[PDB]
Amino acid sequence: SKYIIEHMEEGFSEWVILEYSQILREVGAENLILSSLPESTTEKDIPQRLLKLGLRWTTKDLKGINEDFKDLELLKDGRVCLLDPRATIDLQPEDATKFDYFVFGGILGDDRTKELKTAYPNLLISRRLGDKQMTTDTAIRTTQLIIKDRIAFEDIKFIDYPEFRFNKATEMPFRYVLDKEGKPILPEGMLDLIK
Numbered sequence: 001s002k003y004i005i006e007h008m009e010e011g012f013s014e015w016v017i018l019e020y021s022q023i024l025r026e027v028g029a030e031n032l033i034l035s036s037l038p039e040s041t042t043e044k045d046i047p048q049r050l051l052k053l054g055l056r057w058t059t060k061d062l063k064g065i066n067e068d069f070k071d072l073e074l075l076k077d078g079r080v081c082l083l084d085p086r087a088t089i090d091l092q093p094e095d096a097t098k099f100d101y102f103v104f105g106g107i108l109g110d111d112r113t114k115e116l117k118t119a120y121p122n123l124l125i126s127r128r129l130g131d132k133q134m135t136t137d138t139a140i141r142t143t144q145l146i147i148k149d150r151i152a153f154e155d156i157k158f159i160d161y162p163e164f165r166f167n168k169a170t171e172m173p174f175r176y177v178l179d180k181e182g183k184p185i186l187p188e189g190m191l192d193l194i195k
């Protein structure tokens with residue numbers, strides 16, 4: 001149903017902007033919240049590319065989104081799923097029946113998801129998306145494929161640590177989802193930034 005990203009960076013680097021943009025395009029602005037922005041954040045501090053796409057953002061943390069958005073169902077104990085790389089159980093399609101909200105770490109990893117968990121010990125229930133680390137947009141892409149499209153994790157086709165060779169080179173230490181044409185799905189604009 002609804003996707004929440006907890007922003008755990010200060011600002012918005014080009015990478016973050018591209019990821020969040022892709023997320024906005026795939027889940028729809030009405031189904032995404034960016035929460036836990038720094039206390040002094042105002043509209044001026046939010047990238048115009050994300051505002052343009054209808055980004056719903058808040059400086060409130062998980063325990064406050066309901067105060068801010070009457071549209072959202074009460075974040076209720078046990079019905080919010082934390083996508084957690086160190087969880088003992090992988091998300092499966094029937095979990096769609098068991099959670100209304102899916103929470104992701106707004107991070108650019110070099111763990112931090114455990115800080116998210118520890119922060120809200122009674123709210124969140126963890127589910128994993130496999131044994132290898134994904135970018136936020138890949139994690140959200142996979143979650144949607146499981147919850148909305150009901151594909152088992154094990155039927156999804158990934159690439160582990162793809163190399164992008166522009167001439168006779170960068171390898172991304174993340175797991176990526178494959179498109180029908182067998183290419184890794186990247187946020188629009190990401191490849192140029194990599195080059």
Ligand SMILES: CSC[C@H]1O[C@@H](n2cnc3c(N)ncnc32)[C@H](O)[C@@H]1O
Binds near residue numbers: 082134
């Ligand atoms: C820093 S990665 C961005 C976020 O995507 C989610 N995520 C990334 N990789 C995985 C994984 N293997 N399993 C579950 N969730 C993940 C986590 O919520 C993480 O904070």
